[PDB]
Amino acid sequence: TCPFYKKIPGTGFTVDAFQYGVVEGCTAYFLTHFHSDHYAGLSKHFTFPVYCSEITGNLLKNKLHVQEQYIHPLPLDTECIVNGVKVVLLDANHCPGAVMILFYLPNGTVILHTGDFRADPSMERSLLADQKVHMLYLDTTYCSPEYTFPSQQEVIRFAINTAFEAVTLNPHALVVCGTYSIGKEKVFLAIADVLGSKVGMSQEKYKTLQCLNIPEINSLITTDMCSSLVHLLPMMQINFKGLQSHLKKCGGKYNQILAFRPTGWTHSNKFTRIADVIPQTKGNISIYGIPYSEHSSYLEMKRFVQWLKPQKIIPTVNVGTWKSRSTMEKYFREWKLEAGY
């Protein structure tokens, strides 16, 4: 059964609620983004209206085979009427096609559902600036002050400078980047751009990337692995055994691997600066874990919420333990006392 924090009161709507069968009273199912924990349950046999971004709808049609007649893509930053209710989709600064959803309830209440997001000051000048928000359904993934990480721009600077140095020292080094979902494409695109290469990958991953409206993509990616010196592999293969095996397959073209695992946060964040990050090495294989996050840090989250000043917060992540829920509620009260709302 669908949990309460996936239901929008006063509407027929649910958010990211496709794994619960037919939800009683639901007339439209919203999907914030194409990540499996959120789409879990969709397929070609789904016959209710799904509302989403254009990019999300391209992925639904081509990857999950949802039929066209049931996909309802909406433009961003544009007031739309859904089953008698005004809605707006806003960029969530998460993965491609990810949105936040503003619902203007018939009784005057305004609700923001962040989906998954990485809060940014740029959001303070969207259509959120223009009215009061009563209830916030919040992505609380990193809601504790231990969760610090650098800007995406610092992490990409580190990756490009590391890759360019290695391959200029050794023109026979291969670069490998791990992936298992959409998101974090800047990692492998920025490294291939500094090296003058396309990114090589499996047909299934190429297909996924071609759904993303990324400009000039035909210029940046390929399925011809032999023509590329940046390869994409499943995240599970980014270990010494899987990388040794891959290097065998390249037929003596290369004699070294430099590999990247974009994680979110890891506890090596609480001690070390990005500048000081070092790889794990075994023979001619080195693996870097880089803290490229598509979720808010603690400080980014706190700034957003103190700017928005909601009347009520509903967490959507870390809700399964009493200790997590009590921690989050304590921070929400701090933020409200400090800011004065």
Shortest distance in whole angstroms from residue 334 CB to Ni ion = 26
Residue 35 in contact with Ni ion, rule: CB under 5 A:
yes
Shortest distance in whole angstroms from residue 264 CB to Ni ion = 10
Question: Three-class SS string for the chain?
Answer: CCCHHHEECCCCEEECCCCCCCCCCCCEEECCCCCHHHHCCCCCCCCCCEEECHHHHHHHHHHCCCCHHHEEECCCCCCEEECCEEEEEEECCCCCCCEEEEEECCCCCEEEECCCCCCCHHHHHCHHHHCCCCEEEECCCCCCCCCCCCCHHHHHHHHHHHHHHHHHHCCCEEEEEEECCCCCHHHHHHHHHHHCCCEECCHHHHHHHHCCCCCCHHHCEECCHHHCCEEEEEHHHCCHHHHHHHHHHCCCCCCEEEEEEECCCCHHHCCCCHHHCCCEEECCEEEEEECCCCCCCHHHHHHHHHHHCCCEEEECCCCCCHHHHHHHHHHHHHHHHHHCC
The window from 29-37, 73-81, 142-150, 238-246 that contacts Ni ion (CB under 5 A) reads 29-37
Shortest distance in whole angstroms from residue 39 CB to Ni ion = 10
Shortest distance in whole angstroms from residue 202 CB to Ni ion = 22
Shortest distance in whole angstroms from residue 56 CB to Ni ion = 12
Contact letters for Ni ion, residues 220-259 (x by CB under 5 A): ----------------------------------------
Of 35 and 205, nearer to Ni ion (C-beta) is 35
The window from 34-42, 120-128, 153-161, 207-215 that contacts Ni ion (CB under 5 A) reads 34-42
Of 116 and 300, nearer to Ni ion (C-beta) is 116
Of 16 and 258, nearer to Ni ion (C-beta) is 16
Shortest distance in whole angstroms from residue 42 CB to Ni ion = 15
Residue 205 in contact with Ni ion, rule: CB under 5 A:
no
Residue 118 in contact with Ni ion, rule: CB under 5 A:
no
Shortest distance in whole angstroms from residue 100 CB to Ni ion = 12
Of 35 and 118, nearer to Ni ion (C-beta) is 35
Residue 116 in contact with Ni ion, rule: CB under 5 A:
yes
Of 104 and 298, nearer to Ni ion (C-beta) is 298
Residue 300 in contact with Ni ion, rule: CB under 5 A:
no
CB atoms within 10 A of CB 167: 22
Give the binding site for Ni ion (CB under 5 A): 35, 116
